[PDB]
Design a protein around this ligand. Structure first.
Ligand code: HTL
Ligand code: HTL
Lengths: 785, 785
């Protein structure tokens, strides 16, 4: 114990020394000669206040892992860093562990490695100032605060004997996501999945002020964290005779309780332990400077000596601070290597914190077994039921690497068929009249969308599969956090040892065009714009036409890696236009369907399109309801005049690089063939008009393309009134097509008046009877298969 | 007591009867004859499960208001409905009291009014199914759950006699916004302000399953809500008499409130009480149907009898359910009015819940006094310091209707000058080394952005002013909720009795181009895209060029009403420009600056632009950090080649309707004069390129416009490296301009080679020295002063 404690103290001292050397020094890293003004970095970037807590937690975790390995237990520990601004200290904890030496050859544990890791911190072309995928064993960026407990819970599923210790700052704990994630222990069974160990760094200060949790006493914190499903233990630096002994006792007790919980079963609810660690912010640093308080104050957040390159007293303070660590007793200056204590302290390579096998995606990724797609049919299209049946088959075929997440909307979205295979995860009591609740359920349901997104991202980044479904309007709640994930993917594109990962799959349904029980608060198609905004080859939206297109698309997204895909489709009975082979060929051609109505010819290959024979007008649609309105308008236009030639175009997929998919994106020359250079193009969009305008900016002649979308209007009314309020009903589409072609009002005016009268009569019937007119409800639509 | 109890019971019986009549009946509202199949609505829309709790709370609130007015107390109570899907029951509570009759003449409290409110619920053209601005006394729609506590805390400020009772659902309490807002009592003093009263519905069930909070026992709930700084009380429907217990709870809660608000004896932290009530979901309704459980189960969420128009047993169940409420003992069928008992229950006029004076925007809105604008002094311009000084003057001049909100970032954003007027609100202990903390501070700081947005919207919707500042990267966290606010404004455009409101003002600074201490996670310019997507005349972005432009813009947004404005500017020492507080203010009438470099001529009136002489190319920028690069590129181009003519265009404001402001938006004819029809336009943007592409879709000839902006690339490096990574540096701009102008690549090949070599040398110097080259650091710019 005493030799053990001495080894932890030496490890902490060395980690602190390399942290300060990373922050300040650019030369004379070993301090063999007195410090001058030429051995200081020109710009003193970085942070210091949270580093000592990171060092203490990492060293105690290494000691605990060594003890567990001696006990011959199967538990493997991993570390998660919430405060991503404390990156350099963690870097030091890797350098003396030799994890970084397995990735970079220049980071060997010697004097050259010390110089390499000290000079290149925050340097242009060196290591970044924050956590990144370039760091081994890192899955959470920590830049945007929060999203730390949910990702830790998501990485623990289906990975027993894995203990993930995550560090959460007290200022970060004031966010909504962290506050909501405390209840995630009521839905996950730790015996068959694993244990998450939370440590709260209660330094007491934010960037420039005290914290909410730092103001609370010990009694209030105990009651708050025991009101949820946690068992908290508090250790404070201000009153402890020996801080490291208390930290060792707390970690040993927590891991003993974890081992006791794993070995055995209990027919009740579990209470995972957690550690609150209170310490002075920026401990073991400069105490005072220019009469102000640094240690134990919010002024230690950034660097505490901003003028060390020009002020003599600041340089003396920095030199004394670095010499307080006594690096001569740990390092060996003669040979340039560490002494014999570091080999005694560290365990073997297979059982170290930074090289956990359960967290790595290279040792856990497997292919997904796709069942045969059965394109069953009835009388009307029900895309959500078919998607649920296919996901039920997927759940049957892959019983270890597939999961489902939803914010209590599985029945409302017509995806309940998946309950024929698996139940919903629930660790609390079940009443006899309740159904679909089990401890080992593979569906997790909670109203906090942030927790669901964190669980999905943790499960995917560990190396497995998942799909998250939701309403379309409530998606942007997890908008910004999703963008963070995208950055990770971009930062994984330049790393040669990361490996492949499953795609991030969203199923957004119950769109605003058919919200019957709610009005104007459940219609917000802005999530797809945020998905399409990113430009690092990430972002795909799938726009099915019927149930066959829906099952083809949901089969396509499960075969894609390292991307983000969103599928938006309705859940109401709908007409059917395409069979299985036509839908599959359309998806393999990008997702564009072209039809000529004056000759009744479907075109699925862009070759053999006649230049001598071109359409007079183009009607294009994107989305199921707008496609129904477009085909109804095309039917009316074929009935009435039939002298002009109309080409019908439907788009099934959109990507950040243009029209179609990333693998097969429509080019600038095929757009000219599909869409004629000068003919008008009336376009109906499921979402905002500017979302399509941004994509169509880069294509040929954007002046003639009229685009109509949601336009942010509507209330609780009939579906036809909802379509007519935003000028995307069939009659206004026909009016626009008549006015866009030839003179318009000169010859086709009376038809415009007749169509407006028909729309007025339909709206009057809907207003008077609260149901749609029988002319629209019993409409006879077109067929293509 | 007993007379009051039976009057309350009669009120709740009437409320339940009108709620069911609103949900189901189309005719025979008084049930004079036996119910048939022709008196049922064709579509049964609405919700029922949460309505009885709303009715109980409203009746007890009215009783407690009458009892308060008996003793001549100044406290005025208001009601807030979190579960917005429970709208019809609240409507019933607005019918027996004559609040709805003051707005609508047809809603008079008689038989015709009963028919009017029952027939038109969820009808096309009638009352909506959810809460809306059309309802008097409503400031929160309740569509997106979780924004109820923070809005109440925002609306409760500077109103010492307003007590707001808000209803929160147990499923809604699982959202992170509510869990973050539970701690808001530690920053707002309830003696000089009002008291927010939270009530937890706790019916036990979500849409399709149990709730997390419903699974917790009483002991766990007591600990969780005591640890957060509240005084919870529990009443359950499984008791002898629910109404007597509820009345005792409300009476004791009001006694504590009056004993704490007017004595002022306590100087330490306070403990606001809250009410936790437990009841069966959909109480006093259908018990069983088709062998399933309805009352006390999640199946009572929507309509519990979905086939009452076709099934005889369902119709009989509905008739028995409605006849369970004996409406004959509360109504006179021949007179058509209520009996005398209601006149003994309702309090005096204007002492009623639905007509609170402290909540209405009318009778509380006052114009803001703008101090005189002053110019900036010095070579380098600091926009944030000038903005802070102007806000300090505003705080001085308006000591009762202005407040500031920030997520612990006002020191880092160079806005600390406002600390010369007011401190930060803080109700906890203050250390001797801590500064800018006071109980009566007018600045609220917490890391939860959702709480800040809720406080700002609550303050603004009651008829006062406020400004919220933040980083640009973490703004999208509050994107979607902001969209909800915009919808409110749109509905307020169609309500004739709703008064004016102050604009929603954002200041986002520390942009991604100058994140020195942070890396990739702190660059995300997507919030302005979310704001610009509103299409109801809402959404304005202000893009200052220097400090004078910043103060002119911040003076302009404080003079705008019923809108949303965003101001984005840097905080680094930047060169000054045309802005001398006079030319800048003249530019603000249009928001666009035009300069001709071949004759050194500024243009402020667009009708003076000569059509005979035209620029050879246009360099345009939007944002200060890239305006620097484009004026440097203009300087280099003027130095090297003089036979070409360059027109410099800067844009200061963008709106959803086009270029400029809503009051003065650039037309499609002025765009042709400013931007020539066929000349190339090299445009450089502060944010994403597609955000500007969507706006420029609607203008003339968008094919020739080369838009470059942030490309999601960068790391911890020098500012010039950050500019060059996204191809928006000065050398990139001049290379692009040379490529655009030149007919062939062999005329300016030496120049582009030289500029590429110069950029390579600058990047090499930055890589080797970690400091920008002296050629760039000591650059000499031009001025239009
Ligand atoms: C650099 C950065 O992004 C930091 S660090 C920091 C204070 C962290 O509080 P904490 O007490 O948990 O940290 P610690 O004392 O060092 O442990 C803030 C508010 N920010 C900016 C910020 C703002 N808001 C959000 C959601 N995320 C971030 N990162
Ligand atoms: C219709 C709608 O938008 C409702 S109602 C409702 C149940 C609310 O649970 P709670 O028990 O707290 O309310 P109560 O049953 O009425 O008492 C949900 C989940 N939703 C959809 C939904 C989903 N997610 C979010 C953030 N908001 C909403 N409104």
């Amino acid at each position: 114990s005493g030799q053990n404690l001495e080894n932890i103290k030496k490890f902490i001292r060395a980690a602190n020394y390399l942290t300060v050397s990373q922050i300040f020094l650019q030369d004379n890293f070993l301090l063999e000669r007195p410090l001058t003004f030429e051995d200081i970095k020109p710009r003193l970037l970085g942070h210091w206040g949270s580093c000592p807590g990171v060092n203490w937690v990492y060293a105690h975790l290494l000691n605990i892992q060594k003890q567990l390995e001696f006990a011959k237990s199967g538990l493997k520990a991993a570390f998660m860093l919430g405060p991503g601004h404390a990156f350099p200290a963690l870097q030091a904890n890797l350098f003396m562990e030799e994890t970084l030496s397995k990735v970079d050859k220049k980071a060997t544990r010697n004097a050259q490695g010390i110089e390499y890791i000290s000079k290149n911190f925050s340097w242009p072309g060196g290591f970044p100032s924050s956590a990144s995928p370039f760091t081994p064993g890192v899955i959470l960026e920590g830049g945007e605060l929060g999203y730390s407990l949910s990702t830790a819970f998501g990485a623990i599923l289906d990975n027993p004997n894995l203990v993930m210790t995550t560090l959460i700052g007290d200022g970060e704990a004031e966010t909504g996501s962290i506050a909501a994630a405390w209840h995630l222990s009521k839905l996950i069974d730790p015996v068959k999945n694993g244990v998450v160990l939370p440590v709260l760094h209660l330094n007491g200060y934010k960037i420039s002020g005290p914290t909410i949790f730092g103001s609370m006493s010990d009694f209030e914190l105990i009651q708050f964290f025991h009101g949820a499903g946690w068992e908290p233990k508090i250790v404070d630096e201000y009153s402890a005779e020996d801080f490291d002994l208390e930290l060792s006792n707390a970690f040993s007790n927590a891991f003993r309780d974890i081992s006791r919980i794993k070995f055995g079963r209990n027919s009740k609810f579990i209470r995972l332990p957690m550690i609150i660690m209170r310490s002075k912010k920026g401990s073991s640093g400069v105490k005072e400077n220019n009469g102000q308080k640094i240690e134990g104050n919010s002024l230690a957040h950034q660097v505490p000596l901003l003028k060390a390159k020009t002020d003599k007293n600041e340089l003396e303070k920095l030199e004394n601070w670095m010499k307080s660590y006594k690096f001569d007793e740990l390092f060996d200056y003669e040979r340039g290597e560490f002494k014999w204590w570091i080999n005694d302290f560290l365990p073997e390579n297979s059982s170290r914190i930074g090289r956990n096998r359960f967290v790595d995606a290279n040792l856990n990724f497997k292919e997904l077994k796709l069942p045969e797609i059965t394109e069953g049919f009835g009388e009307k299209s029900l895309a959500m039921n078919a998607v649920g049946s296919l996901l039920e088959k997927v759940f049957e075929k892959n019983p270890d690497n597939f999961r489902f997440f939803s914010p209590d909307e599985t029945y409302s979205n017509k995806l309940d068929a998946i309950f024929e295979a698996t139940s919903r995860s629930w660790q609390r009591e079940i009443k006899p009249w309740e159904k679909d609740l089990a401890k080992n359920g593979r569906v997790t349901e909670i109203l906090s969308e942030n927790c669901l997104q964190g669980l999905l991202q943790g499960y995917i980044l560990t190396g497995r599969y998942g799909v998250l479904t939701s309403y379309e309007a409530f998606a942007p709640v997890i908008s910004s956090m999703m963008d963070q994930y995208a950055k990770f993917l971009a930062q994984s594109k330049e790393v040669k040892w990361r490996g492949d990962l499953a795609s991030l799959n969203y199923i957004l349904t119950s769109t605003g065009w058919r919200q019957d029980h709610n009005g104007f608060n459940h219609q917000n198609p802005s999530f797809i714009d945020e998905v399409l905004r990113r430009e690092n080859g990430i972002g795909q939206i799938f726009l099915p036409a019927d149930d066959n297109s829906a099952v083809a698309a949901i089969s396509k997204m499960l075969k894609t890696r390292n991307n983000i895909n969103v599928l938006v489709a309705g859940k109401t009975p709908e007409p059917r236009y395409f069979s299985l082979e036509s839908a599959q060929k359309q998806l393999e051609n990008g997702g564009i369907f072209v039809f000529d109505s004056w000759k009744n010819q479907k075109i699925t290959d862009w070759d053999s399109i006649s230049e001598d024979d071109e359409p007079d007008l183009i009607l294009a649609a994107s989305g199921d309801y707008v496609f129904k309105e477009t085909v109804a308008a095309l039917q009316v236009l074929l009935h009435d005049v039939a002298q002009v030639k109309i080409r019908l175009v439907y788009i099934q997929a959109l990507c950040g690089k243009g029209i179609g998919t990333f693998e097969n994106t429509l080019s600038k020359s095929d757009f000219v063939k599909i869409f004629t250079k000068d003919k008008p193009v009336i376009f109906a969009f499921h979402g905002y008009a500017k979302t399509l305008k941004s994509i169509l900016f880069d294509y040929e002649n954007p002046a003639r393309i009229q685009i109509n979308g949601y336009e942010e209007k509507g209330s609780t009314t009939t579906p036809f009134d909802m379509l007519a309020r935003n000028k995307v009903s069939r009659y206004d589409i026909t009016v626009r097509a008549l006015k866009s072609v030839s003179e318009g009002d000169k010859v086709f005016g009376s038809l415009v008046k007749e169509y407006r009268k028909r729309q007025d009569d339909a709206l009057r019937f809907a207003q008077e009877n609260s149901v749609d007119a029988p002319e629209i409800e019993n409409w006879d639509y077109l067929r293509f298969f």
